[PDB]
Amino acid sequence: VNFPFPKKMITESNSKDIREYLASTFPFEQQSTILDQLKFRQENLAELKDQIILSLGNWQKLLDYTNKLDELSNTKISPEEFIEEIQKVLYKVKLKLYSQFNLSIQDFALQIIHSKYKSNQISQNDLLKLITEDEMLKILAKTKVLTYKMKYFDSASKMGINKYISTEMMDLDWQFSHYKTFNDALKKNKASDSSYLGWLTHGYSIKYGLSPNNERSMFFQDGRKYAELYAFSKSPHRKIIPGEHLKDLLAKINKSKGIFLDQNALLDKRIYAFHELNTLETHFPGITSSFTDDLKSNYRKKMESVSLTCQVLQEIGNIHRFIESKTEYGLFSIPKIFSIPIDYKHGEKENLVSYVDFLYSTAHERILQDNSINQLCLDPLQESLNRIKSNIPV
Amino acid sequence: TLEKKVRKGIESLITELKLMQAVLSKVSKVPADQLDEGVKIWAGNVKELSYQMEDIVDAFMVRVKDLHRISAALEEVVLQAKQLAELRQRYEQEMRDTSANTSVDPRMMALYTDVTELVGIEETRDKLINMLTEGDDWSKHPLKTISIVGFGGLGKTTLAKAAYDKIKVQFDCGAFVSVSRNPEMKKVLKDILYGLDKVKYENIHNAARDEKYLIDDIIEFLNDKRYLIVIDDIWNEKAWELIKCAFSKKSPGSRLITTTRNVSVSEACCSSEDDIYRMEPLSNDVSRTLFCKRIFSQEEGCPQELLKVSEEILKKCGGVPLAIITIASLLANKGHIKAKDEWYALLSSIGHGLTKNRSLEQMKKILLFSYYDLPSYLKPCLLYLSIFPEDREIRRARLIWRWISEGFVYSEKQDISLYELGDSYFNELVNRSMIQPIGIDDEGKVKACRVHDMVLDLICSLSSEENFVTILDDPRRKMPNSESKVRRLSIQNSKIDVDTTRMEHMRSVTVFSDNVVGKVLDISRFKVLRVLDLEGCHVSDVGYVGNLLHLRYLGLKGTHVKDLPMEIGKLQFLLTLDLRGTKIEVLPWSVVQLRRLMCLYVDYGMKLPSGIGNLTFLEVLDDLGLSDVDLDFVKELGRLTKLRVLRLDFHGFDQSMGKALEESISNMYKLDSLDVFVNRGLINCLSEHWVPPPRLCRLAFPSKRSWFKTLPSWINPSSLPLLSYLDITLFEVRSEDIQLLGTLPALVYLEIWNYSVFEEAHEVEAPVLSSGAALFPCATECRFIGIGAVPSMFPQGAAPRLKRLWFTFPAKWISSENIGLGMRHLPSLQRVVVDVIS
């Protein structure tokens, strides 16, 4: 079906029409909108060993650390020692089914610290003194991308949203909501370390197949890159008169910028170039600031126009992950006690199909139009609009 | 027994070689016009024989079944040498009355050209006038020289004559005198004498006194006068010093001008870099005006359809006011012979076949002058430049390693690294004004080199008449009429004729940015191969090398190589091994078996097997990965006391074993540069009690998140006085650290990072240069990060040469009086922007 643009209007006395339902419903509690509780994880803290005991026969350390994490979950320990207790498993395990449960060991253990911080059980300065640690940055930047591909990548590919997975929009997920503190509290004090951890995170993301390619990545997986990256982050005049190993970086970034500005070429490498250049721009502002080329190519607004579609498609995929569940929510994400049955809900007819029209109207309101952009913005958005209007009744 | 006869023939063979390079060196000196055809053909054949016996001796050397093959080969080669002897001897004649007159100078009538013809010569003639006549006022300043260095025919005698014509009536004497490649000193001095007075010294060319009495005469004639002599085209400065003594008396108000094609002889004059006058190619607009002056009538917009051809061709000349004259005169026989077709034919022809034309060879002699003036052991170095494509930068390190691997560098003094010898060859090529250098790499020296376009095709032709190289280009699409005798092949964009049937003796082969490799070409069929170059390819199949024995150079930069075979130990002879940009992440154990090597451009991602100290001959190592390593292997690094340049990054051994390696470093004394990379930590490697190697120049530090506590004590003007590069970062800062650093002799490059300012709540203080006056005799590049360097460290007489400066400036000091600038310092200290902090 070739559904046209759902022309609507989100004005005063209409934002609270639906967000009020979103202010209390099961989804959107850990999310937000672009128009602008501990028992849930505790039940998984009980379900932590649903199947570990089934195949203990090698497979004993999984249950050995399982009950240890269960003990550490509910027991109250001073912050000066809780980190030492929890790091015993973190610094011990090195690395198919094994890792399928090893990640759940690491992922659930780290969620405790943020939960205690939300309850003011852990001092903020104590958290600061441990987040600056080098190894834990590598632990988190690895476990996030591993956990996402554990559950959401299986269903993302089928919908066709796999090609539009962006690393910098991962905190917006309801499950990965605790990262907001790890981001803002870290950037407020040590802002450089935020770009540092993002630079690492995209680096592991590239080589795990999130943004795969047959050619090497000349921007990541090398400490010497960050040397110049941080050198220009302080002196605002080291790029106008650059040293060597920096003309090379400019030559590899402007080439990708021209690739992005190109029209006919294959699209997957535009996707790869986008997921690189947006990361470098958001973490290292003023690194592709070609003051002459961008103005006569409308690059500054083109990047934002092609960026907004990613969040739009993420929200559409979230709605799809909600409709059929009423497991696409992901393994170890929703406990069976709080599971969602199959029955249709009356509140969906007033807050879901209407909200889709609001979302598409908000998508079709300030995005510029260009034939190159249309292949990047108009075509995928129209495909999503066609797909979203063929499944709501069923 | 049997081997004894072969080995006793080998020395006879090598003597035969030495004789043949003797005679070939003798013949190649003369230009290829005075040579008769018999001698040319004989030389052509003896060169091929030279290749054959070099092949035989190399094969015998690498091997020791084979004895009988070597025997047959040497016997037959002796047979062709013996035959060719009387083939030459059969046809000789004397012809006593063959005295053809010597050729005139090709660039003489060029001196006789119209004054109202040259364009753009202005605003350079005036500048060269007032860079020396500014002292003509108060005409009592001591005499000085101003040399002019250039290349090709960019125009040096022209401007010398121009300055030699305007400011003359204010002088008593003067002489414009030329010098050839092999001058006669008495001839030159007679030339000077006749140029001073033609009356008393009318028939001065007749008398033959001696080299000395006429020198006394010219010295006597130069009393109480200002001469202003100019001498041009002087080569091999040993000539210059003889004339120099003729100017040895005090003479206020005089001076002289010199031109030459070698900068390595101009610095022998004028005792200062301020008096050297570099000359540069003309600008695009002036070149366009000159180009349209000749061909077109008075205006250039008439075609409006070959314009793009015009600027496309004109950039090939670059700025040389010789090519833009030659092509302008060639292309218009009488008013645009035809349109856009011969222009395309000409554009295609350049690079491979443009030189062979009419009224053009009168210009190529002026360029082959430089090639002929080269000594031996340097002609192959220049002719090696034809391999690489037309417009591509060439890293000097690649050239040096290729030369050494080929075998063009050797000596018998045992005091030479055999690598700085290659650097010497490269610098000799550069100072002859015949290669353009660019950049300054991590070695502290030039990054890469570029070759002029028409010079490139000219040397291509010179290498083409023999079989020095072979090029496969689609505008050329030519193959020599003998597939057998091909040694060097430089494959390029052409991907059609990749036939490999008949090159058994294949010296070297290279591919440039082509996907045709592998799917069409086979390398394993080359029984012998000196160097292999495959950088930029997209093939990972290099596992047939075990079938090959004679490789020296092995370049695999950016090749998508996943793995390399375990059978690489068979390559006992090898000099270089570059693996940067490859997918392989662990080297095979069969590198202990290797014996000879000097450079290993490896990436820290890969794993180095234990037993590295065996490679005693190793001379430079790059980007070594030091993580999870046992202490014995760490100490193995101090075993090899020959390494010069080492690059280290690491994440996983910050223990006392760091100090174990720290003193292990001092076991070596051949160092010249070093650098250490580590992430956001205090430097737990270097102690304050550790003697450094005596020779150190660079000592960089790429990391900026890590820091030292303070300035190390072992840095002192006492030890390591050879530094020309600093690159330090540390936590704190002291106003005495700068004072200490100001005592070191050179310190050309300075870059200091203050960690606490850009990472902790600290205010940029103002360090004070307390002791001394200058502390910086020569510091062109100085960088201060997070440290306040006001312009008033000292009056202008502190840093004579300083082009660049960087420091941080608080906004609170705006109302202060410690920023008291406004004067112009001695160096070009007028281009600066300061990072200001609120």
Ligand SMILES: Nc1ncnc2c1ncn2[C@@H]1O[C@H](COP(=O)(O)OP(=O)(O)OP(=O)(O)O)[C@@H](O)[C@H]1O
């Ligand atoms: N502005 C100009 N306009 C026209 N022709 C020029 C101009 N400048 C130089 N030329 C030409 O360039 C040549 C000058 O050569 P140049 O002065 O370099 O000679 P040189 O010093 O004897 O040695 P070499 O040519 O080897 O450097 C002449 O052909 C001259 O006509």
